């Protein structure tokens, strides 16, 4: 925009990370070995990151500049400048939570203070070496006692 005043940093909530992507990758494949073209749903994929050839889909039903902004109904690859593979991000939906390391294995461990746990006691918890109590129902533990 050519008009800056500041540059603010902040943590990215899990609800944003999935609001930047253009698709989720689910195959650790980069490119076919014989035809040298990005695989489907894997890294380098053309449907979630962009076209590899300027104004050309994956299958090839749209080739020239006359088809911009439209999406091939077969390979779902939008047709536009191949320079968009340098601005689009994807995401991965983890099967189980995972803690950012910049905040646990630092000094001082940010969680160690946010939760008041000894770092060598938090590492045991987040690396599946010991259990941790997460809630206790004092009401019943009082009466049913």
């Amino acid at each position: 925009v050519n008009f800056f005043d500041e540059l603010r940093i902040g943590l990215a909530t899990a609800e944003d990370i999935r609001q930047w992507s253009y698709g989720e990758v689910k195959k650790p494949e980069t490119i076919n070995y014989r035809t040298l073209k990005p695989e489907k749903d894997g890294l380098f994929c053309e449907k979630i990151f962009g076209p590899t050839r300027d104004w050309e889909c994956y299958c090839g039903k749209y080739k020239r500049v006359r088809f911009k902004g439209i999406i091939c109904e077969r390979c779902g690859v939008e047709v536009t400048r191949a320079k968009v593979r340098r601005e689009r991000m994807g995401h991965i939906e983890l099967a189980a939570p995972v803690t950012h390391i910049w905040y646990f294995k630092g000094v001082p461990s940010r969680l160690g203070y946010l939760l008041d746990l000894a770092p060598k006691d938090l590492e045991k918890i987040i690396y599946f070496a010991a259990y941790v109590i997460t809630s206790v129902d004092e009401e019943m533990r009082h009466n049913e006692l």
Partner: protein, 107 residues
């Protein structure tokens, strides 16, 4: 080996000129995922609109219209029961179910 070794990219570059007028007409569809999401997708004007779309969300979504053509052809995944049925006859299993049963019934 520090030298000038020339490689090549994967893709292509065209010196064509961007133009925002006189381009093919398009038509927008509105698919919707399973967890109530709204996703707008463009399509060529003369194009066969599909029935299901792998949406930006990451899960297949249906159209905005009411076609509902076919949720069929699924094949159940080979489970443990099928593998047991393979190498075993019902009778045996039945008999077994009885014997062990007695053990729990007789403690």
């Amino acid at each position: 080996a520090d030298r000038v070794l020339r490689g090549s990219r994967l893709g292509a570059v065209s010196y064509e000129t961007d133009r925002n007028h006189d381009l093919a007409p398009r038509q927008i569809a509105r698919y919707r995922t399973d967890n109530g999401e709204e996703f707008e997708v463009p399509f060529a004007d003369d194009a066969e609109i599909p029935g299901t779309w792998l949406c930006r969300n990451g899960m297949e979504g249906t159209l905005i219209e009411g076609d509902l053509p076919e949720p069929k052809k699924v094949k159940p995944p080979r489970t443990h029961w099928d593998m047991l049925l393979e190498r075993r006859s019902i009778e045996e299993l039945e008999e077994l179910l009885k014997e062990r049963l007695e053990l729990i019934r007789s403690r």
